[PDB]
Design a protein around this ligand. Structure first.
Ligand SMILES: *[C@@H]1O[C@H](CO)[C@@H](O)[C@H](O)[C@H]1NC(C)=O
Ligand SMILES: *[C@@H]1O[C@H](CO)[C@@H](O)[C@H](O)[C@H]1NC(C)=O
Ligand SMILES: *[C@@H]1O[C@H](CO)[C@@H](O)[C@H](O)[C@H]1NC(C)=O
Ligand SMILES: [K+]
Length: 299
């Protein structure tokens, strides 16, 4: 359904296309937050419009995450409003350093604002993120309320920190704290095998515990009721494996791209702020296609 903002003109300072706008936004409980919003050039106030949240890595900004993730590039994302929120202290809820910052409330209040002021398709609200932002994407998927409002989730090199000491950290078996509020949560996860910051194999980090990425992906396939069975595809001369979980009916509802030799990088063929060399594929068009595949079901 199109939101309450359908028929409302854009804020007086905004018009479609061009550069993203920086906006200060004060949450109900009084914390002033910040986001950048990119309005697609084809925006129409009467047309229910999809929306993508894109969350930066630790130590990064909304501005750098816009350039990194390319959701404002209309060659790759012609139709969706792109929103780049700023994390307090350049980090997100879920990081070992983040204390009593409710970024889930920030995201839910932002979405309520966008529904009020824009023509939002509430069946096509999405979240993606790099590293700490990818961890935060997973926390939205794992939140009883946020999981029912956001259609699909694309953590890239995400940091799924569990409150377990390095010494007690068993990355293949560590419980992953998660309470999705509906079945069939769509998860698209990209990870490099040579990631030193958020290792593919997980393990102790900064005093806490990261799961292995296969464990992360398997717990998503399992908790949604689809067991451990995958299909595998070889891509780019076998340098990339694509794993798709689900049955014949929902094949891919959980998908993982394993990128051989890739470090802690948003995948791009061209150089980006993360990686000067480029890799085999662009993650962003795959994410946009995944979002298109998986809308929020009625009820
Ligand atoms: C947002 O709020 C901060 C804090 O007062 C201010 O310095 C900044 O210029 C404001 N930015 C915008 C875009 O309104
Ligand atoms: C997919 O299944 C095969 C066994 O069929 C397994 O060896 C592989 O590790 C699985 N992929 C992931 C990401 O767990
Ligand atoms: C990028 O490629 C260069 C060679 O052109 C290589 O020496 C370097 O280690 C690569 N990776 C990074 C992260 O700079
Ligand atoms: K390259």
């Amino acid at each position: 359904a199109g939101s309450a903002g359908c028929g409302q003109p854009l804020p007086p300072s905004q018009n479609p296309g061009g550069s993203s706008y920086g906006v200060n936004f004060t949450l109900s409980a009084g914390t002033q937050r910040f986001y950048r919003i990119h309005i697609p050039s084809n925006y129409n106030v009467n047309t229910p419009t999809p929306l993508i949240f894109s969350f930066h890595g630790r130590g990064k900004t909304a501005e750098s995450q816009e350039k990194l993730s390319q959701f404002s590039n209309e060659d790759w994302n012609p139709d969706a409003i792109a929103v780049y929120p700023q994390g307090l202290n350049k980090e997100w809820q879920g990081d070992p350093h983040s204390k009593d910052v409710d970024d889930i409330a920030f995201t839910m209040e932002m979405l309520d604002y966008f529904q009020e002021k824009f023509c939002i398709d509430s069946t096509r609200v999405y979240a993606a993120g790099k590293s700490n932002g990818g961890g935060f994407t997973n926390l939205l998927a794992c939140d009883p309320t946020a999981s029912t409002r956001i259609a699909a989730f694309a953590p890239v090199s995400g940091a799924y920190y569990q409150d377990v000491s390095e010494e007690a950290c068993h990355p293949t078996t560590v419980p992953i704290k998660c309470s999705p509020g509906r079945p069939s949560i769509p998860i698209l996860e990209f990870h490099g095998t040579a990631d030193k910051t958020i290792p593919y194999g997980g393990g102790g980090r900064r005093g806490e515990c990261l799961p292995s990425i296969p464990h992360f992906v398997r717990e998503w396939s399992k908790r949604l009721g689809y067991g451990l069975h995958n299909t595998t595809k070889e891509l780019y001369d076998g340098n990339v494996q694509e794993y798709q979980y689900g049955n014949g009916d929902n094949r891919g509802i959980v998908t993982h791209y394993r990128i051989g030799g890739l470090g802690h990088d948003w995948p791009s063929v061209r150089p980006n702020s993360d990686n000067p060399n480029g890799t085999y594929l662009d993650a962003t068009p795959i994410i946009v296609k995944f979002f298109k595949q998986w809308v929020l079901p009625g009820s």
